[PDB]
Design a protein around this motif. Structure first.
Motif, PDB file in Angstrom:
ATOM      1  N   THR A 149       4.038  -0.833   8.335  1.00  0.00           N
ATOM      2  CA  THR A 149       3.720   0.190   7.349  1.00  0.00           C
ATOM      3  C   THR A 149       2.357  -0.059   6.691  1.00  0.00           C
ATOM      4  N   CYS A 150       1.514  -0.853   7.335  1.00  0.00           N
ATOM      5  CA  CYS A 150       0.205  -1.134   6.771  1.00  0.00           C
ATOM      6  C   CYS A 150      -0.604   0.150   6.599  1.00  0.00           C
ATOM      7  N   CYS A 151      -1.359   0.221   5.504  1.00  0.00           N
ATOM      8  CA  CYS A 151      -2.208   1.369   5.166  1.00  0.00           C
ATOM      9  C   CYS A 151      -1.484   2.714   5.059  1.00  0.00           C
ATOM     10  N   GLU A 152      -0.155   2.689   5.031  1.00  0.00           N
ATOM     11  CA  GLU A 152       0.609   3.920   4.893  1.00  0.00           C
ATOM     12  C   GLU A 152       1.129   4.135   3.478  1.00  0.00           C
ATOM     13  N   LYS A 171      -1.880  -1.173   1.162  1.00  0.00           N
ATOM     14  CA  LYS A 171      -3.217  -0.707   1.501  1.00  0.00           C
ATOM     15  C   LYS A 171      -4.124  -1.909   1.735  1.00  0.00           C
ATOM     16  N   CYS A 172      -4.617  -2.039   2.962  1.00  0.00           N
ATOM     17  CA  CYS A 172      -5.506  -3.134   3.320  1.00  0.00           C
ATOM     18  C   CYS A 172      -6.943  -2.633   3.377  1.00  0.00           C
ATOM     19  N   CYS A 173      -7.866  -3.527   3.709  1.00  0.00           N
ATOM     20  CA  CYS A 173      -9.278  -3.171   3.792  1.00  0.00           C
ATOM     21  C   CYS A 173      -9.919  -3.549   5.124  1.00  0.00           C
TER      22      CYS A 173
HETATM   23 ZN   LIG Z   1      -3.589  -1.065   6.670  1.00  0.00          ZN
END
Ligand SMILES: [Zn+2]
Lengths: 366, 95, 103, 95
Positions: free
Chosen positions: A239-242, A247-249
């Motif tokens: 579920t990364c960045c969803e 929220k990752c960079c």
């Molecule tokens: Zn992400």
């Protein structure tokens, strides 16, 4: 909102994305020209099997700072090619067709037992030229030959440029040498690595320039579709960045690094001190950084200011050590002395160090 | 505790050559095994028939080559003959 | 060994023992088991390679008899070699006659 | 106190390459010197004639290669062409 140093990078990213809000026209014309090209190519016996590799994606911007330059790759099915590794380079290979009952339309392009990159490229460019001359109400110009990897470069009107790269597709196992690469086991999964190995690999025509000579009919491996997959599915958590909590960079770090390299190349384009570097070196370096930092908490967006810096340092470290392994081919040194001289490497090292010590002024100058 | 012969580990090694990540299930193992046995019995039977037809007492690489050219169909025949010539030649190259 | 001398993976020693104790002729030239082991290894590499790819299409990392049947029957000159061979748990080639399709 | 050019020390170095103990007397020095001059003038003259014959303004390695293939007789020609290709290629290999 974030750790100190973020706001400037965030403003750079916002300007760069603002540069992408008027693409629909350009992308549409690109879609039209590519569709025409594919329509003609599928009619030639030799190219009945050409297709779009990134399906449903008639663009891939390699320059984050050049919105009117597109990159497309035309894949060619080409089954059962026996590869023979050229002089232990691990990345450049000769292609020999294995036994096959149903005649393969690439026979015409043989030079003895080797499939000649030259003849294939010649037929490809001839077809493209004659088809784009069928474009009556739009000046689409084929740019003159420069190498083999940027097979064809087309110019639409006076603003659009599209790089078309032809690639052979192999469904077979990844070449024996290129095994220890794609070390995503502790970052994405071992099972995702297995699944990705099941995907086809590609061959792009690329002369291997040895000091004694360059062999005109050699091919280089391509995993750029794998690179796209890992770029767009990049976290340990599915579920990364969803969501706001995950929220990752990572993508932002890649974009900022590419923007840095592109501006530094633009300022020194006329002195030939940066010609040899490309976005691929930074993309591979970023993938190494994701390998070294597998956890999504090591890429929290609020730490952008720090995360980019660490990536920069890794790039600088490579620049100092003349060692940057291709992410899929651990024995392919992109930063070896035989491909780039030390002088250009120290030049790029010093310029990036100045930019990092001065809060990246080059981002604002031009 | 006897020793039953079969081409299990050999077919396995050729597999690991041609697909370093793909395994092979015991039933497909048995199928590859019976395929090796069938083809080898065909080729040796035809080599024997060649030898007896020309009143020779040796199955040399000439007879195996003509057996391969008789059994395997066209392109498979040519490539198999090349592979065998290369192997035999390499064997001669050693001592 | 003697299979390594020829750059083979199939055992030239075993193929020699089988050409000798199989009553195919009184004598067996020492260059015959090499040629035969090479032809066997080539045909096995051919079969296993076409098989492997089909398994990979079925997104599977393990050949099963169905994949061998798909490889042997799709290839035109492997079919003719094994035209009279049924493969256990092999199934058939998906093939509906064009007259039977709906209209 | 001028600077008269001649290939003395060059021929000397090639000698020390090919016979690390054999010297060369000043008269044979002069002979090797005039030989270098003669052959170089022949090759450049033929390269010039090639260039003007094909209406080019550059003596590139193509013209020097055809000059060597025209002047030096058969085997000497082939080996000299190989040596020159190797040198030029190595020169391209640097920067
Ligand atoms: Zn992400």
């Amino acid at each position: 909102d974030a750790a100190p140093g973020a706001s400037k990078l965030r403003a750079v990213l916002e300007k760069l994305k603002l540069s992408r809000d008027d693409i629909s026209t350009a992308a549409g014309m690109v879609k039209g020209v590519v569709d025409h090209l594919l329509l003609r190519l599928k009619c030639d016996s030799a190219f009945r099997g050409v297709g779009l590799l990134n399906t449903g994606s008639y663009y891939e911007h390699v320059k984050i700072s050049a919105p009117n330059e597109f990159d497309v790759m035309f894949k060619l099915e080409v089954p059962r090619i026996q590869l023979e590794e050229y002089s232990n380079t691990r990345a450049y290979y000769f292609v020999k067709f294995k036994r096959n009952p149903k005649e393969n339309p690439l026979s015409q392009f043989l030079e003895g037992e080797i499939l000649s990159a030259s003849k294939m490229l010649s037929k490809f460019r001839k077809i493209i030229k004659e088809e784009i001359n069928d474009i009556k109400d739009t000046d689409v110009i084929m740019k003159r030959k420069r190498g083999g990897s940027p097979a064809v470069t087309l110019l639409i009107s006076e603003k659009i440029s599209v790089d078309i790269t032809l690639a052979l597709e192999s469904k077979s196992s990844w070449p024996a040498s290129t095994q220890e690469g794609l070390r995503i086991q502790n970052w994405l999964s071992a099972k995702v690595r297995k699944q990705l190995r099941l995907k086809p690999f590609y061959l792009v025509p690329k002369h291997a320039k040895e000091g004694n000579g360059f062999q005109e009919e050699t091919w280089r491996l391509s995993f750029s579709h794998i690179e796209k997959e890992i770029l767009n599915n990049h976290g340990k958590s599915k579920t990364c960045c969803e969501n706001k909590e995950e929220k990752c960079c990572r993508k932002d770090c890649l974009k900022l690094m590419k923007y840095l390299l592109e501006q530094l190349k633009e300022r020194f384009k006329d002195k030939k001190h940066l010609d040899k570097f490309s976005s691929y070196h930074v993309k591979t370096a970023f993938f190494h950084v994701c390998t070294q930092n597998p956890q999504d908490s090591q890429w929290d967006r609020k730490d952008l200011g720090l995360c980019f810096d660490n990536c920069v340092t890794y790039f600088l470290q490579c620049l100092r050590t003349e060692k940057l392994e291709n992410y899929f081919i651990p024995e392919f040194n992109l930063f070896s002395s035989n491909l780039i001289d030390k002088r250009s490497k120290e030049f790029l090292t010093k310029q990036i160090e100045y930019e990092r010590n001065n809060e990246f002024p080059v981002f604002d100058e031009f | 505790r006897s020793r039953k012969e079969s081409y299990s580990i050999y077919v396995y090694k050729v597999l690991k050559q041609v697909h370093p990540d793909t395994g092979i299930s015991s039933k497909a193992m048995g199928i590859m095994n019976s395929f090796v046995n069938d083809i080898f019995e065909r080729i040796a039977g035809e080599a024997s028939r060649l030898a007896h037809y020309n009143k020779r007492s040796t199955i040399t690489s000439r007879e195996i080559q003509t057996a391969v050219r008789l059994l395997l169909p066209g392109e498979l025949a040519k490539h198999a003959v090349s592979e065998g010539t290369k192997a035999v030649t390499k064997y001669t190259s050693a001592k | 060994t003697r299979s390594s001398r020829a750059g083979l993976q199939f055992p030239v020693g075993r193929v020699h023992r089988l050409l000798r104790k199989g009553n195919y002729s009184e004598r067996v030239g020492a260059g015959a088991p090499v040629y035969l082991a090479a032809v066997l290894e080539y045909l096995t590499a051919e079969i296993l390679e076409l098989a492997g790819n089909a398994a990979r299409d079925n997104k599977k990392t393990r050949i099963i008899p169905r994949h061998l049947q798909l490889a042997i029957r799709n290839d035109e000159e492997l079919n003719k070699l094994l035209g009279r061979v049924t493969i256990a748990q092999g199934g058939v080639l998906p093939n509906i006659q064009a007259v039977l399709l709906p209209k």
